[PDB]
């Protein structure tokens, strides 16, 4: 029962691997009391208010060092405390910033059910203010349809922090998607125009991207991959499933049911 | 004793019986007419 | 001994919920309902797998937690005995649950069936809400 | 308690607009699609139309070097297999009732 | 018999034999009269 | 959910998590069923300390899920944690389905016990006979005298006919039930044979129905022996009565056979 | 008694469903 967290390395140089001690700190805090209150010992906040800190600083260090599962664990426990008990202090300071970060992560791993599901439980801050939370939903809305210039413009506009960790993944999953979509939009593209519509410049990266796919070049020309005619002019599979269907019609027509 | 177990079993059987009885009572008529 | 007590108690622990609804906590009402559900559905089939489900869902959504795990796996989905009054609100609840999770194809049909199961009485309290949602979701779907 | 559902309706609006434009015209420059749908920029209209073509909303092609969008002509749906499916779907219902 | 009751939120604070068509209300947004549009458009040119 | 920290290796943290989960499972059974396989992983690691505890929470989950076969598997796996039998509906329904599975398997083996059976779990027959003893101590012997048939086990029957009840009442009751309702010779003849010798064991040799049993299953030598014993009692009265009762119901072939035993 | 409450229930369950069979065949023969 001591404020070991008061000796929190931070300031401008928290480079030291705090995990070596942090593990012991978490073990001792669990071994103490009320790691999850359920319902007991109400009005005692030292084991509670500290736990929020002993989790927020953990999760921030977690995002810095790229520990995806550990970050998921910290997210879970902190999302528990943030909501469950409303007899505590306003918490605040970092609640919205963290919640927005969690939503951003959900978008990054391409799960669109959870992002919508977890958009709930926020009363009205989506439009009330909470810029830390207007940014994720705005990015989602821009991403849902073809509007992509605004996405890249906003990638350089984050009031919270760098967020390069997730917007990176986003850039990659936009590059590959656009490469897939251009395969059927139109017959021909110019090489300069292709290099510029995709946001990369003129590095060997364009050449490599074309190599990774097909994109056979011509004299400043890109050939269209054309097929779109294999499926038509077929009846045999229809000629079998129609037979099945008509037999099914006659089945339950004269027999007593 | 073990009465609860027996109660459960017997109750389940009797609960089932009535539905069958009903679904057969209608069938007899049609044949008679 | 519930050859009558069961269908008598249904209404009882339906007004019982309203009592807390108009006043104080509901979480421990949820605990009680959860217990009571398996207190039933184990005495072979006894019904109440209709009323208790609606009672549990009435304010499970109101507290704004969209848990769905147990609803997809619920064994009480099929009481089959609802007097054509419980079935409507049960279908309405499950339809809104399904529609809130980016699923529009099935919510339309299930909740339209729910709406058209509504009785003829002059009161239009819940029909207002079901209609409002039934046309928001249709705008969403295509 | 319905703000969250209707706040995502913009995509439906833009889909309806682009489908109407596709059905109405046959060859239209994108220098006017933006003005008609007030997107305030013509370049992103290309991405919007491309996403529309992706999902089979419209089969129109686009000459990016030029700018105009040209659309295919698909008529005589009576010969297609879909009306048989439409009839079957309700034959089932009328037999069940 | 005729139980017909529902618990919550009764609200709202308390004809045409021509089948309805949506289009009728579309131009109810404006263009009150073809007259007005033609009359006040033709004069320009 | 707290199941997140089940991904940690430390057994002390597992013994924190499990002892929350087993206390709260009643209200989150579906959400924990999402991942119970991980608890089966903890049950699989024989190196894990407190291994038995995972089986109980897993049984609770599968009970809530209706996977009663799996619930019974892990109830047996949790073993002596089921020393409690006296309150929760959980254990009551599990031991009931235990009774059902055991009796159905025993009926299957009533064809042949040596019939390449799946080896019996000693925990299974343990708890089943423990509940049988419970029924004995509750004085509810009318349950046991019936259930003894459906276990298809003769020794417990041969024993428990002797109990707090007066032997002849329950004995005659059971024999009547057997003759009325027992569906096949394969078991009925065994039951009759194993029981009816009690009437030669009982302090009164109750031959009167011994004749009946020895003509429902034909054994001329045995009835001739007991007849000769009664004859050598030098009292004719019961030795007369038993044989005139024999004549009214024995087969002509049976009499024409037993004449040989009696004459030589 | 309590054991007969199981045996008789089994016997009625057995006897019913054989009632079903003759009626099922009889309706077939009747139109014939």
Swiss-Prot record, chain A:
<keyword id="KW-0647">Proteasome</keyword>
<feature type="domain" description="PCI">
    <location>
        <begin position="69"/>
        <end position="238"/>
    </location>
</feature>
<dbReference type="GO" id="GO:0043161">
    <property type="term" value="P:proteasome-mediated ubiquitin-dependent protein catabolic process"/>
</dbReference>
<dbReference type="GO" id="GO:0008541">
    <property type="term" value="C:proteasome regulatory particle, lid subcomplex"/>
</dbReference>
<feature type="cross-link" description="Glycyl lysine isopeptide (Lys-Gly) (interchain with G-Cter in SUMO2)">
    <location>
        <position position="204"/>
    </location>
</feature>
<keyword id="KW-0832">Ubl conjugation</keyword>
<comment type="similarity">
    <text>Belongs to the proteasome subunit S14 family.</text>
</comment>
<keyword id="KW-1017">Isopeptide bond</keyword>
<feature type="modified residue" description="Phosphoserine">
    <location>
        <position position="13"/>
    </location>
</feature>
<dbReference type="GO" id="GO:0005838">
    <property type="term" value="C:proteasome regulatory particle"/>
</dbReference>
<dbReference type="GO" id="GO:0005654">
    <property type="term" value="C:nucleoplasm"/>
</dbReference>
<dbReference type="GO" id="GO:0000502">
    <property type="term" value="C:proteasome complex"/>
</dbReference>
From Swiss-Prot, chain D:
<comment type="function">
    <text>Component of the 26S proteasome, a multiprotein complex involved in the ATP-dependent degradation of ubiquitinated proteins. This complex plays a key role in the maintenance of protein homeostasis by removing misfolded or damaged proteins, which could impair cellular functions, and by removing proteins whose functions are no longer required. Therefore, the proteasome participates in numerous cellular processes, including cell cycle progression, apoptosis, or DNA damage repair.</text>
</comment>
<protein>
    <recommendedName>
        <fullName>26S proteasome non-ATPase regulatory subunit 3</fullName>
    </recommendedName>
</protein>
<feature type="modified residue" description="Phosphoserine">
    <location>
        <position position="29"/>
    </location>
</feature>
<feature type="modified residue" description="Phosphoserine">
    <location>
        <position position="41"/>
    </location>
</feature>
<comment type="subunit">
    <text>Component of the 19S proteasome regulatory particle complex. The 26S proteasome consists of a 20S core particle (CP) and two 19S regulatory subunits (RP). The regulatory particle is made of a lid composed of 9 subunits including PSMD3, a base containing 6 ATPases and few additional components. Interacts with UBQLN1 (via ubiquitin-like domain). Interacts with ERCC6.</text>
</comment>
<comment type="similarity">
    <text>Belongs to the proteasome subunit S3 family.</text>
</comment>
From Swiss-Prot, chain F:
<comment type="similarity">
    <text>Belongs to the proteasome subunit S1 family.</text>
</comment>
<comment type="subunit">
    <text>Component of the 19S proteasome regulatory particle complex. The 26S proteasome consists of a 20S core particle (CP) and two 19S regulatory subunits (RP). The regulatory particle is made of a lid composed of 9 subunits, a base containing 6 ATPases and few additional components including PSMD1. Interacts with ADRM1. Interacts with ZFAND1.</text>
</comment>
<protein>
    <recommendedName>
        <fullName>26S proteasome non-ATPase regulatory subunit 1</fullName>
    </recommendedName>
</protein>
<comment type="function">
    <text>Component of the 26S proteasome, a multiprotein complex involved in the ATP-dependent degradation of ubiquitinated proteins. This complex plays a key role in the maintenance of protein homeostasis by removing misfolded or damaged proteins, which could impair cellular functions, and by removing proteins whose functions are no longer required. Therefore, the proteasome participates in numerous cellular processes, including cell cycle progression, apoptosis, or DNA damage repair.</text>
</comment>
UniProtKB/Swiss-Prot annotation, chain G:
<comment type="similarity">
    <text>Belongs to the AAA ATPase family.</text>
</comment>
<comment type="subunit">
    <text>Component of the 19S proteasome regulatory particle complex. The 26S proteasome consists of a 20S core particle (CP) and two 19S regulatory subunits (RP). The regulatory particle is made of a lid composed of 9 subunits, a base containing 6 ATPases including PSMC4 and few additional components. Interacts with NR1I3. Interacts with PAAF1. Interacts with TRIM5. Interacts with ZFAND1.</text>
</comment>
<comment type="function">
    <text>Component of the 26S proteasome, a multiprotein complex involved in the ATP-dependent degradation of ubiquitinated proteins. This complex plays a key role in the maintenance of protein homeostasis by removing misfolded or damaged proteins, which could impair cellular functions, and by removing proteins whose functions are no longer required. Therefore, the proteasome participates in numerous cellular processes, including cell cycle progression, apoptosis, or DNA damage repair.</text>
</comment>
<protein>
    <recommendedName>
        <fullName>26S proteasome regulatory subunit 6B</fullName>
    </recommendedName>
</protein>
């Amino acid at each position: 029962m001591y404020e070991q967290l008061k000796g929190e390395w931070n300031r401008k140089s928290p480079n030291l691997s705090k995990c070596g001690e942090e593990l012991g700190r978490l073990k001792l805090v669990l071994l103490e009391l009320n790691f999850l209150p359920t319902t007991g010992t109400k009005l005692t906040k030292q084991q509670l208010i500290l736990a929020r800190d002993i989790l927020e600083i953990g999760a921030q260090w977690s995002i810095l060092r790229k520990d995806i599962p550990s970050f998921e664990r910290y997210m879970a426990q902190l999302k528990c405390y943030y909501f469950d008990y409303k007899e505590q202090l306003p918490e605040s300071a970092y609640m919205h910033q963290l919640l927005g970060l969690n939503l951003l992560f959900l978008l990054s791993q391409n799960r669109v059910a959870e992002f919508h599901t977890e958009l709930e439980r926020l009363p009205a801050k989506d439009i009330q203010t909470n810029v830390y939370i207007k940014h994720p939903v705005s990015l989602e809305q821009y991403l849902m349809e073809g509007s992509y210039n605004k996405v890249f413009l906003a990638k350089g506009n984050i009031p919270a922090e760098s967020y390069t960790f997730f917007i990176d993944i986003l850039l990659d999953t936009i590059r590959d998607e656009i490469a897939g979509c251009i395969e059927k939009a139109y017959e021909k593209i110019l090489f300069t125009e292709a290099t510029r519509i995709l946001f990369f410049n003129t590095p060997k990266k364009m050449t490599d991207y074309a190599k990774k796919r097909g994109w056979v070049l011509g004299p400043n020309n890109y050939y269209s991959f054309a097929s779109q005619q294999q499926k038509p002019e077929d009846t045999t599979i229809p000629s079998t499933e129609l037979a099945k269907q008509v037999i099914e019609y006659a089945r339950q027509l004269e027999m007593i049911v | 004793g073990l009465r609860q177990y027996y109660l459960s079993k017997i109750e389940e059987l009797q609960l089932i019986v009535n539905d069958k009885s009903q679904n057969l009572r209608r069938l007899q008529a049609q044949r008679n007419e | 001994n519930r050859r009558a007590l069961d269908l008598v108690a249904a209404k009882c622990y339906y007004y019982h919920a309203r009592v807390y609804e108009f006043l104080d906590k509901l979480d421990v009402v949820r605990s009680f309902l959860h217990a009571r559900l398996r207190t039933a559905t184990l005495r072979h089939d006894a019904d109440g797998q209709a009323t208790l489900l609606n009672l549990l869902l009435r304010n499970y959504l109101h507290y704004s937690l969209y848990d769905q795990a147990e609803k997809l796996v619920s064994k009480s989905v099929f009481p089959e005995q609802a007097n054509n009054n419980e079935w409507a609100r049960y279908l309405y609840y499950t339809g809104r649950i399904k529609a809130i999770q980016l699923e529009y194809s099935e919510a339309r049909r299930t909740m339209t069936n729910a709406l058209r199961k509504a009785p003829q009485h002059t009161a239009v309290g819940f029909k207002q809400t079901v209609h409002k949602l039934l046309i928001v979701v249709e705008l969403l779907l295509g | 308690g319905t703000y969250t559902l209707i706040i995502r309706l913009r995509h439906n609006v833009i889909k309806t607009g682009v489908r109407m434009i596709s059905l109405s015209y046959s060859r239209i420059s994108l220098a006017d699609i933006a003005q008609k749908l007030q997107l305030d920029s013509p370049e992103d209209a290309e991405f919007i139309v491309a996403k529309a073509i992706r999902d089979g909303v419209i089969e129109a092609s686009i000459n990016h070097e030029k700018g105009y969008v040209q659309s295919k002509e698909m008529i005589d749906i009576y010969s297609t297999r879909e009306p048989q499916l439409a009839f079957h779907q309700r034959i089932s219902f009328c037999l069940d009732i | 018999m005729s139980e017909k009751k529902q618990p919550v939120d009764l609200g709202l604070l308390e004809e045409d034999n021509w089948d309805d068509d949506n289009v009728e209300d579309d131009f109810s947004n404006q263009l009150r009269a073809e007259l007005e549009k033609h009359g006040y458009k033709m004069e320009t040119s | 959910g707290i199941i997140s920290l089940l991904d940690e290796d430390e057994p002390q943290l597992k013994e924190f998590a499990l002892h929350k989960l087993n206390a709260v499972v009643n209200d989150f059974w579906a959400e924990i069923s999402e991942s119970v396989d991980k608890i089966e992983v903890l049950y699989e690691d024989e190196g894990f300390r407190s291994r038995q505890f995972a089986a109980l929470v897993a049984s609770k989950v599968f009970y809530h899920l209706g996977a009663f076969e799996e619930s019974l598997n892990y109830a047996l796996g949790a073993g002596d944690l089921f020393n409690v039998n006296d309150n929760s509906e959980y254990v009551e329904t599990i031991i009931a389905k235990c009774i059902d599975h055991y009796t159905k398997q025993c009926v299957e083996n009533a064809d042949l016990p040596e019939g390449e059976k799946k080896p019996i779990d000693q925990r299974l027959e343990g708890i089943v006979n423990k509940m049988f003893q419970r029924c004995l101590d509750d004085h509810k012997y009318k349950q046991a005298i019936g259930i003894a048939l459906e276990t298809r086990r003769l020794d417990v029957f041969e024993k428990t006919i002797l109990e707090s009840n007066d032997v002849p009442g329950m004995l005659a009751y059971s024999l009547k039930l057997c003759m009325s309702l027992m569906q096949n010779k394969q078991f009925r003849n065994k039951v009759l044979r194993v029981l009816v010798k009690i009437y030669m064991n009982l302090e009164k040799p109750d031959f009167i129905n011994v004749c009946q049993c020895l003509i429902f299953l034909d054994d001329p030598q045995a009835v001739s022996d007991i007849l000769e014993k009664l004859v050598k009692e030098d009292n004719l009265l019961m030795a007369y009565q038993i044989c005139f009762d024999l004549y009214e119901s024995a087969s002509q072939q049976f009499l024409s056979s037993v004449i040989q035993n009696l004459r030589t | 008694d309590l054991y007969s409450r199981y045996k008789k229930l089994q016997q009625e369950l057995e006897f019913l469903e054989v009632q079903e069979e003759y009626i099922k065949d009889e309706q077939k023969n009747l139109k014939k």
